[PDB]
Design an enzyme around this catalytic site. Structure first.
Site, PDB file in Angstrom:
ATOM      1  CG  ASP A  25     -48.903   2.720  18.699  1.00 12.60           C
ATOM      2  OD1 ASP A  25     -49.886   2.348  18.027  1.00 12.60           O
ATOM      3  OD2 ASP A  25     -48.309   2.061  19.590  1.00 12.60           O
ATOM      4  CB  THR A  26     -53.456   5.212  15.230  1.00 13.70           C
ATOM      5  OG1 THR A  26     -53.293   3.939  14.568  1.00 13.70           O
ATOM      6  CG2 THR A  26     -52.875   6.309  14.362  1.00 13.70           C
ATOM      7  N   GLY A  27     -52.793   3.067  17.761  1.00 12.37           N
ATOM      8  CA  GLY A  27     -53.334   2.070  18.669  1.00 12.37           C
ATOM      9  C   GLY A  27     -52.988   2.297  20.133  1.00 12.37           C
TER      10      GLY A  27
END
Ligand SMILES: CC(C)CN(C[C@@H](O)[C@@H](Cc1ccccc1)NC(=O)O[C@H]1CO[C@H]2OCC[C@H]21)S(=O)(=O)c1ccc(N)cc1
Ligand SMILES: CC(C)CN(C[C@@H](O)[C@H](Cc1ccccc1)NC(=O)O[C@H]1CO[C@H]2OCC[C@H]21)S(=O)(=O)c1ccc(N)cc1
Lengths: 99, 99
Positions: A25-27
């Site tokens: 999850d880059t967020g």
């Protein structure tokens, strides 16, 4: 690997003797899982999401294998709807976003 | 480009003719933007994340430029604390996770 995003980017993870999976999850600033077996003492911490803020259990110096890459860092245990690997560990396995 | 993850992966976007910025989020199934006017008919939806659910308007077939790349697809509009580009549009620009 080079991972496309047509489905959720789920990978194997291993902590201690437990094989799990989690969403890359880059967020997410932080790594959060729903449960970790016999993890010891923890420190309370607040984390924010789209819907509001949740209390989590913060464990530091956790050794975790992610997709066959070793990382060591902070793992939060909290009411996340899916296990997430956040940027604090993605940097350690050298993940990048490319387009 | 190649984006490392030592800070949040924010990029310029263009939507409704207006320049904004947004988080490239592999953990998000769908794109969610802060309150704004868009064309067309919308449908009410709910989206769930950490800390709970929020109500959004779903607009279909919206053009969005992401760091100079054109994408067309579903955009949810609602009280997110940050603009998020999810997989539904990341796939249209060929974004991948690499490690
Ligand atoms: C994207 C938002 C606009 C969504 N709206 C939700 C709504 O609860 C908020 C969303 C809202 C509120 C303020 C600023 C931006 C968005 N209120 C609103 O639109 O204004 C009305 C509420 O009290 C009054 O405030 C002005 C007129 C009235 S909504 O179109 O009615 C709607 C409702 C339910 C779902 N599931 C999906 C969408
Ligand atoms: C929790 C994931 C399964 C889903 N979320 C995407 C995720 O990237 C969010 C995206 C995000 C980012 C900032 C604020 C709200 C949501 N990040 C997030 O909740 O991270 C939390 C853990 O690390 C912290 O760093 C950010 C807040 C903490 S989500 O924002 O709730 C969401 C859910 C569905 C859609 N369509 C779009 C987004």
């Amino acid at each position: 690997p080079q991972i496309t995003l047509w489905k959720r980017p789920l990978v194997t993870i291993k902590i201690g003797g437990q094989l799990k999976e989690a969403l890359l999850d880059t967020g997410a600033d932080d790594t959060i899982i729903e449960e970790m077996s016999l993890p010891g003492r923890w420190k309370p911490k607040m984390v924010g999401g789209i819907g509001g803020f949740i209390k989590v259990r913060q464990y530091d110096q956790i050794i975790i294998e992610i997709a066959g890459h070793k990382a060591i860092g902070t793992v939060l245990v909290g009411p996340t709807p899916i296990n997430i690997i956040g940027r604090n560990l993605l940097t350690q396995i050298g993940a990048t976003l490319n387009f």
